[PDB]
């Protein structure tokens, strides 16, 4: 009822998370763990009395999907200690071995909790010593993982010690546990739990050997304080320099140092994250180290139980909720001395894969569209065709699993078993060489436009998409032109820049064309139209520069509608492109695969079999992280091929890798199939079809 000022003392804070296989009990465990102490969500906090002193324990949301690298790894470096949860019936699984691997990767100290022991007693009918056998082999399994993947400084005192209470046993549904210290201190042994269980005398058991007591005791007695933890954690956590005065702001858990925090997850807008150094209050100033912008906070607050509560000044080593943070990502390093963030600069990316969806039941018609658009703005990478009845809607995102998650929102959560189309790869179109000049006549023959199109230099393209140069109509030509002139472009061309559009640009290099300024917006609409659908397979265009070299505009707007400016410039752009050797581009993925060494060849061979290439390779002892690039079109079904080849011990993710040119040998076939899917004639139009005659 007044516990808000434990946060002063860092060595009573416990930053922890629960690692578990699925159905193994983790949600239940957490619910009755923290209900047991009084009072997905981002973070939920509980205060617990251990040895007369009160501890503030942080239970942070931690996903467990092993086909998700990034989220899982992010949540687990957010925490300092972990409760590994294993079903006693099922045991240590390959997936358990994985989540343990990452847990232990970023120096997270572990404690084991065998759950579902009631199932052993009532349902599975074991002798006490069969239970001893089964407990001890789960323990031994885990301790050969700790043997195998722990840092050399830790692989024998980071083991789990049944005898010192680093291993609890119990039932999360029946709110009971047992460890040897709790026995030491209460005289409760297994015979009574078995007995009471068998009578069905749950309520006695509840309060003869209470879950949250035994478990949280194990937490405090064995999982480390933030200042306990950062002493070895922050160096491994990211490639900075410790000699910074900010280095031992983060090395210990210094509140009076510069503040430094990271966002763990986002939720009206509310960001939950961890404070590494310093102290936030509402309204100071914060530079978001690599999200382009910088900002400040409207409310600051902390967590009491499951409930969002508001306070002001919070020191380091705690978990905070903040609002007002516009474009912060999950994983956002927020601090104000500018340094480099704790994980890599993540490309913001465009959606690259699509599936078509149809409701089974006629009655789910009315506003599926805004459900799916709840998630379309929940996850910024998603786009869909809104409204009317098409068949209905295309869902476009970042990959197969990305989307199929959303499918199992279509019914784990909302009520519809669903039929989904095959997936299609969003391809794009571009050119390889510069064109001769091309003319665009309007139908009334009164307006003419002389253009060339040129392949865009990858430096400038990169510049546009990593944000250095901005999308949209140019709001400051003089400044933009310079930044184009920094990359190998002619300033006296760059100054006529007019528009940036989806990896292309439009430049006015005309001298004294009367009335051009009157059509220029229409010229841009036509430009955009020209880019929206390419001339090869009506796919979006990338890496093209359209330069207007000359023009003849009529003096009366009666001869200058959209009806005349659009087709003229649009087909000029397509004609030019067809003369500039137009090509297909496909999306790639960066694939990050983390495994035990024994499997590498298999992994490697798999990537080779998907037109993929190994890019990089990071090794830490017996754990191996392979980084590759492979085309999206070749990556379907990867979770299966890879689960098979690494026997479910691979932990992996993808990131957008940009787009690359499709080889000519496969290009044609792919173009014909795209056109065919689109209801078009397979054979791509050539320049003679697109350009007008004599």
């Amino acid at each position: 009822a007044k516990i808000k000022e434990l946060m002063l003392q860092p060595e009573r804070i416990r930053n922890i998370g629960i690692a578990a296989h699925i159905d193994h009990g983790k949600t239940t465990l957490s619910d009755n763990l923290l209900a047991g102490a009084g009072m997905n969500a981002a973070n939920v906090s509980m205060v617990h009395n251990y040895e007369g002193k009160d501890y503030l324990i942080n239970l942070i949301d931690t996903p467990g999907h092993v086909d998700f690298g990034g989220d899982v790894t992010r949540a687990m470096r957010a925490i300092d200690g972990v409760i590994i949860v294993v079903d006693a019936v099922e045991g240590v699984m390959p997936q358990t071995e994985t989540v343990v691997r990452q847990a232990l990767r970023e120096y997270v100290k572990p404690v084991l909790f065998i759950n579902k022991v009631d199932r052993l007693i009532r349902e599975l009918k074991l002798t006490p010593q069969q239970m001893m056998e089964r407990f001890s082999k789960i323990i031994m399994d885990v301790n050969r993982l700790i043997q195998r993947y722990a840092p050399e400084e830790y692989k024998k005192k980071w083991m789990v010690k049944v005898e010192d209470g680093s291993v609890a046993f119990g039932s999360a549904y029946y709110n009971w546990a047992l460890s040897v210290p709790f026995m030491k201190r209460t005289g409760v042994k297994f015979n009574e739990i078995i007995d009471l269980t068998l009578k069905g005398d749950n309520r006695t058991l509840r309060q003869k050997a209470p879950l949250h007591v035994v478990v949280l005791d194990m937490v405090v007695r064995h999982l480390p304080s933030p200042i306990e933890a950062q002493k070895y954690r922050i160096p491994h956590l990211w490639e900075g320099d410790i000699s910074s005065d900010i280095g031992q702001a983060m090395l210990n858990c210094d509140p009076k140092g510069k503040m430094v925090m990271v966002v763990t997850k986002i939720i009206g807008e509310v960001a939950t994250g961890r404070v590494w150094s310093g102290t936030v209050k509402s309204g100071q100033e914060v530079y978001l180290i690599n999200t382009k912008r910088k900002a400040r906070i409207q409310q600051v607050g902390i967590y009491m139980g499951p409930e969002r509560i508001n306070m002001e000044a919070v020191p380091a080593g705690n978990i905070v909720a903040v609002t007002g943070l516009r474009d912060a990502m999950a994983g956002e390093t927020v601090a104000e001395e500018q340094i480099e963030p704790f994980e890599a600069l993540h490309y913001v990316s465009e959606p690259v894969v699509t599936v078509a969806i149809e409701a089974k039941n006629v009655k789910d018609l009315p506003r599926l569209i805004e459900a799916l658009r709840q998630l379309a703005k929940e996850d910024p990478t998603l786009h869909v065709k809104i409204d009317e009845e098409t068949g209905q809607h295309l869902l476009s995102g970042m990959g197969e699993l990305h989307l199929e998650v959303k499918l199992y929102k279509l019914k784990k959560d909302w009520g519809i078993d669903i039929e989904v189309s095959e997936p299609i790869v969003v391809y794009r179109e571009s050119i390889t060489k510069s064109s001769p000049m091309v003319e665009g006549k309007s139908p009334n023959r009164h307006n003419r436009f002389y253009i060339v199109v040129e392949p865009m230099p990858d430096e400038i393209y990169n510049a546009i998409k990593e944000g250095i140069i901005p999308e949209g109509r140019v709001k400051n030509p003089k400044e933009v032109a310079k930044k184009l002139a920094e990359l190998g472009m002619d300033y006296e061309i760059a100054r006529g820049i007019v528009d940036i559009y989806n990896g292309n640009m439009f430049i006015d290099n005309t001298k004294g064309v009367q009335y051009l300024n009157e059509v220029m917006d229409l010229l841009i609409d036509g430009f955009h139209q020209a880019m929206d659908e390419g001339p090869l397979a009506r796919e979006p265009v990338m890496k093209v520069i359209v330069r207007l070299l000359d023009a003849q505009v009529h003096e009366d707007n009666v001869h200058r509608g959209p009806a005349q400016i659009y087709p003229a410039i649009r087909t000029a752009i397509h004609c030019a492109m067809m003369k500039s050797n137009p090509v297909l581009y496909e999306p790639y993925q960066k694939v990050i695969i983390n495994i035990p060494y024994e499997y590498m060849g298999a992994v490697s061979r798999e990537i080779t079999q998907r037109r993929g290439q190994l890019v990089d390779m990071k090794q830490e002892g017996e754990v191996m992280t392979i980084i590759a690039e492979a085309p999206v079109a070749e990556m379907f079904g990867f979770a299966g091929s890879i689960r098979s080849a690494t026997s479910g011990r691979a932990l992996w993710s993808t990131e957008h890798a940009g787009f690359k040119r499709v080889p000519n040998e496969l290009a044609q076939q792919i173009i014909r199939q795209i056109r065919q899917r689109k209801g078009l004639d397979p054979n791509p139009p050539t320049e003679k079809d697109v350009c007008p005659l004599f």
């Binding site: 001893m132 407990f135 001890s136 323990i139 049944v162 005898e163 047992l178 040897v180 026995m183």
Partner: peptide, 9 residues
């Protein structure tokens, strides 16, 4: 793992 046996008795 000797502590484990203490829990049974």
């Amino acid at each position: 793992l000797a502590g484990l046996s203490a829990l049974f008795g």
